[PDB]
Amino acid sequence: RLKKRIFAAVSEGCVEELVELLVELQELCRRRVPDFLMHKLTASDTGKTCLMKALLNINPNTKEIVRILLAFAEENDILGRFINAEYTEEAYEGQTALNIAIERRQGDIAALLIAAGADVNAHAKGAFFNPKYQHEGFYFGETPLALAACTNQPEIVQLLMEHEQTDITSRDSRGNNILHALVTVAEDFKTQNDFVKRMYDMILLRSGNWELETTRNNDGLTPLQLAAKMGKAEILKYILSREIKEKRLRSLSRKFTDWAYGPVSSSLYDLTNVDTTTDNSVLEITVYNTNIDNRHEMLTLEPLHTLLHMKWKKFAKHMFFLSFCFYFFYNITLTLVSYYRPRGWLQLLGRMFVLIWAMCISVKEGIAIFLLSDAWFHFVFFIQAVLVILSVFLYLFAYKEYLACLVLAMALGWANMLYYTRGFQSMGMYSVMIQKVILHDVLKFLFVYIVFLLGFGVALASLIEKCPNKDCSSYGSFSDAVLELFKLTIGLGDLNIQQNSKYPILFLFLLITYVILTFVLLLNMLIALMGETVENVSKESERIWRLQRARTILEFEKMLPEWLRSRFRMGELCKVAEDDFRLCLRINEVKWTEWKTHVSFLNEDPG
Amino acid sequence: VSKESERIWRLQRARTILEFEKMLPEWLRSRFRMGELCKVAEDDFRLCLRINEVKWTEWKTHVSFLNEDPG
Amino acid sequence: WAYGPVSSSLYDLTNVDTTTDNSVLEITVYNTNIDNRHEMLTLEPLHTLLHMKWKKFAKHMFFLSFCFYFFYNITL
Numbered sequence: 094r095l096k097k098r099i100f101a102a103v104s105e106g107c108v109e110e111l112v113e114l115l116v117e118l119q120e121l122c123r124r125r126v127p128d129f130l131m132h133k134l135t136a137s138d139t140g141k142t143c144l145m146k147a148l149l150n151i152n153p154n155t156k157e158i159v160r161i162l163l164a165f166a167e168e169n170d171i172l173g174r175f176i177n178a179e180y181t182e183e184a185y186e187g188q189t190a191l192n193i194a195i196e197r198r199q200g201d202i203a204a205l206l207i208a209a210g211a212d213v214n215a216h217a218k219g220a221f222f223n224p225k226y227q228h229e230g231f232y233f234g235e236t237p238l239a240l241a242a243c244t245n246q247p248e249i250v251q252l253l254m255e256h257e258q259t260d261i262t263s264r265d266s267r268g269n270n271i272l273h274a275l276v277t278v279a280e281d282f283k284t285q286n287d288f289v290k291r292m293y294d295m296i297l298l299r300s301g302n303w304e305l306e307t308t309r310n311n312d313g314l315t316p317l318q319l320a321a322k323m324g325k326a327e328i329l330k331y332i333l334s335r336e337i338k339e340k341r342l343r344s345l346s347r348k349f350t351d352w353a354y355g356p357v358s359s360s361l362y363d364l365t366n367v368d369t370t371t372d373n374s375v376l377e378i379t380v381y382n383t384n385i386d387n388r389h390e391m392l393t394l395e396p397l398h399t400l401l402h403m404k405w406k407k408f409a410k411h412m413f414f415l416s417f418c419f420y421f422f423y424n425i426t427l428t429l430v431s432y433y434r435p436r437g438w439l440q441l442l443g444r445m446f447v448l449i450w451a452m453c454i455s456v457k458e459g460i461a462i463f464l465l466s467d468a469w470f471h472f473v474f475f476i477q478a479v480l481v482i483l484s485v486f487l488y489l490f491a492y493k494e495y496l497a498c499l500v501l502a503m504a505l506g507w508a509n510m511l512y513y514t515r516g517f518q519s520m521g522m523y524s525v526m527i528q529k530v531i532l533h534d535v536l537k538f539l540f541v542y543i544v545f546l547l548g549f550g551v552a553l554a555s556l557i558e559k560c561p562n563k564d565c566s567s568y569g570s571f572s573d574a575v576l577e578l579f580k581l582t583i584g585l586g587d588l589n590i591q592q593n594s595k596y597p598i599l600f601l602f603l604l605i606t607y608v609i610l611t612f613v614l615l616l617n618m619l620i621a622l623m624g625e626t627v628e629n630v631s632k633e634s635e636r637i638w639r640l641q642r643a644r645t646i647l648e649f650e651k652m653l654p655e656w657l658r659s660r661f662r663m664g665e666l667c668k669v670a671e672d673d674f675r676l677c678l679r680i681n682e683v684k685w686t687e688w689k690t691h692v693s694f695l696n697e698d699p700g
Numbered sequence: 701v702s703k704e705s706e707r708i709w710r711l712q713r714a715r716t717i718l719e720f721e722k723m724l725p726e727w728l729r730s731r732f733r734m735g736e737l738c739k740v741a742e743d744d745f746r747l748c749l750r751i752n753e754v755k756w757t758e759w760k761t762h763v764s765f766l767n768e769d770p771g
Numbered sequence: 772w773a774y775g776p777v778s779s780s781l782y783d784l785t786n787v788d789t790t791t792d793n794s795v796l797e798i799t800v801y802n803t804n805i806d807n808r809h810e811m812l813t814l815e816p817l818h819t820l821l822h823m824k825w826k827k828f829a830k831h832m833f834f835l836s837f838c839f840y841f842f843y844n845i846t847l
Contacts, residue, residue, distance in 0.1 A: 146768075150768065185769065196775060244759070751816075765772065
C-alpha cells in the first residue's frame with residue numbers, strides 16, 4: 094500500500110506535501126540496496142515508473158514534483174537507471190520520459206530532463222509507433238528529435254541539436270533517418286499549414302553536408318525518391334529548387350543563379366538524380382507511379398517540365414511520327430489485300446510486310462503487357478496483331494474461314510488509329526475526352542437501354558400469334574422483335590399497327606411506351622449529363638494528356654541503344670564550387686517586381 | 701441537381717437501411733448491437749461509438765482523457 | 772486516447788440508436804415534414820451509425836432481395 098499511495102499522490106497532483114511525506118517514509122523504510130528502490134518505485138506489469146505517471150497527467154504543479162522526484166533519486170545515487178527507464182510492454186517498447194515530456198509539449202521539463210542525464214537517442218521501437226494500418230498508431234521517426242520535429246516544436250529541436258551526445262544521422266528500424274520521417278509525415282497545405290518544409294530546411298542547414306540526403310532506407314530510397322514515390326508534391330517542389338544564399342553553405346543547394354543582369358536572369362538547375370540515368374531516378378518514379386493520383390502537380394515542377402519538353406522535341410517527335418507512318422502503311426496494305434481478295438514482285442513484299450509487322454507488334458505488346466484505364470491500348474494492339482497472324486496462318490492452311498479474322502482485324506486497326514491521334518495537343522485532348530465520355534456515361538446508358546430493349550422485345554414477341562402467309566406480321570420470332578425495336582430507335586423503320594396481334598391496343602401501348610422511355614427520356618437526359626461532364630473535364634484534359642505524353646516519351650527513351658542515349662544527354666556541366674562539377678539545365682527568366690542588388694552569382698559578366 | 705443528387709440518394713439509402721432493420725427478429729438485433737460499453741465516470745457505463753480523428757492545426761497539451769496510455 | 776495529432780473521440784449512443792420507442796435516428800429519417808434532412812443525416816454519430824449498419828447487414832439483405840426479384844422476373 095506504499096507504491097499505490099505514491100502513484101496516486103504523484104498523479105493526482107492535489108499536493109506536493111503528501112508525496113514529500115510519502116518519500117520521507119520510503120527513505121526511512123530503505124534506511125534498514127538500490128534494486129529495492131527500483132522494484133518499489135515502478136510497476137512490474139508494464140515497466141512504467143513514477144516519472145512517466147507524473148508527466149502523463151500534467152497539472153499546474155508538476156514542475157515541482159518532477160524536481161523533487163529526480164532530486165530524491167539523485168540523493169540515493171540511482172538517477173541513471175531511474176531517469177533512463179523504459180517501458181517493457183510489447184506494444185510501446187522503448188518509450189522513455191523524454192517522449193512523454195515532448196508529446197505533451199512541455200519545454201521546461203524537457204530541458205530539465207535533458208540536462209539531468211537522459212538518453213537522447215531513445216528508440217521507441219514499439220508496436221504503437223511503427224504501425225501497420227493507420228489511424229491506430231503514430232509513426233514519427235522513433236527518436237526524440239524526430240518527435241519534436243514532427244509535432245511542430247522548433248524550440249525543442251534547437252535545444253536537441255545544440256546538444257553534443259545527440260546523433261543526427263541515426264537510422265531507425267524501418268531504415269528512415271530524420272529526413273525520411275519528415276517526408277513520410279508531410280501532408281499538404283490545406284491540412285497542415287506548411288510547417289514540415291521549414292523543419293526540413295532547418296535540420297538540413299544545422300548539419301551542412303550531403304550526409305543526410307544520400308542515405309537509403311530498407312528499400313534503397315533517398316528523401317528525394319521517397320518524396321517522389323509517395324505523392325508529396327510540396328516537399329518535392331522545395332527540394333528540386335532549393336537556393337541557399339549564405340556563403341559557407343552554398344554547395345548545399347540545387348539551383349544557382351549565375352547570370353543575372355537586370356530584370357532578366359538565368360537560373361541553372363541541377364540534374365544529378367532527376368534525369369533517368371540511374372537505377373530509379375525521380376522522373377521515372379514520378380511518371381510510372383500508378384498509386385498516388387496526385388501526378389497532376391508533380392509533372393509541372395521546375396526541372397521535370399523542361400526535361401520532358403527537351404526530350405520530346407529532341408527525339409520523341411521523330412520516333413512517334415515515324416511509328417505512326419509505319420502503322421498507317423501497315424493498315425493500308427491490310428485493307429487493300431483484304432478488299433482485293435481472290436473471289437508477283439510487289440504483292441509478296443506486302444504480304445511479308447504484314448506478317449513481320451504483326452509479329453513485331455505482338456512481340457512488343459506481349460513484352461510490355463506482363464508489367465501491370467491507362468494501358469488497355471496494349472491489349473487492343475495485341476488482339477489486332479493476333480487476329481492478323483491467325484488469319485494468315487489459317488489461310489496458308491486448307492481453310493476458307495480466314496475472312497472473318499481478316500476483316501475484323503482491318504476494322505480494329507482503322508478504329509485503332511485513335512491512339513496515334515495523341516501527338517497533337519488539340520487532338521490529344523479530343524481523344525482523352527472521348528475516352529472519358531465512354532467511361533463516364535455511355536456504359537451506364539447502354540446497360541439500361543439493353544435491359545429495356547430485351548424486355549420489351551420478349552413482350553412484343555409473346556403478344557404475337559403464329560400465323561400460318563408468313564408475310565402476315567413483322568414481329569415474329571424474338572430476333573425480329575428486338576431488331577424492329579432497334580431500328581425504330583435509330584429512326585429507320587416503319588411503325589404500323591395491323592400486326593396480326595390479338596390485343597392490338599395493348600401492342601400499341603407497349604410500342605408507344607418504349608418509344609417514349611428511350612427517345613424522349615434517356616437520350617436527352619444523357620445529353621444533359623454529358624453537358625455536365627464536359628464543363629468539368631476540359632480543365633483536366635490538358636493534365637491527363639500531358640501525363641500520357643510523358644509516359645510515351647519515357648517509353649521511347651528505352652528503345653534506343655546505349656551510345657545514342659550517351660549521345661543526347663540533356664544538360665551540360667557547370668563548375669559550381671571549389672570542385673563540384675554537377676550536370677545542370679539552364680532556364681532563363683524575367684521578373685519585373687522583385688528589385689534587388691545582385692550578390693550571389695557564378696559569373697560576373699552575363700553571356 | 702447534381703449537387704443534391706448525393707444528398708437525396710443518401711437519404712433514400714438511409715430509409716432502406718432502417719426499413720431492413722425491422723424485418724430481423726429479436727435475437728439477431730440483440731446480436732448486432734453497434735457500439736460497445738465504456739465506463740465513463742464514477743459509475744456511468746454508457747454505450748458508445750469510437751471515431752478516430754487526425755488534426756494538424758490545433759496543438760494543445762492534452763489534459764482530458766479516459767485511458768492514459770493510448771491503445 | 773489522444774497522443775499526437777491523432778486522437779480517438781468516443782461518442783455516446785444512449786438515445787440515438789433505434790433501440791427505444793422513438794430514437795433520434797428513426798425520427799430524423801422518417802420525418803417527412805421538414806425538408807431540412809439534407810443537413811441532419813450528416814452529423815457526428817448518425818453518419819457512422821448508418822454506415823456501420825449498412826456494411827454490416829444491409830448490403831447482404833439488399834443483394835439477396837435483388838437476386839430473388841431477378842429470378843422471379845426471369846421465371847415470369
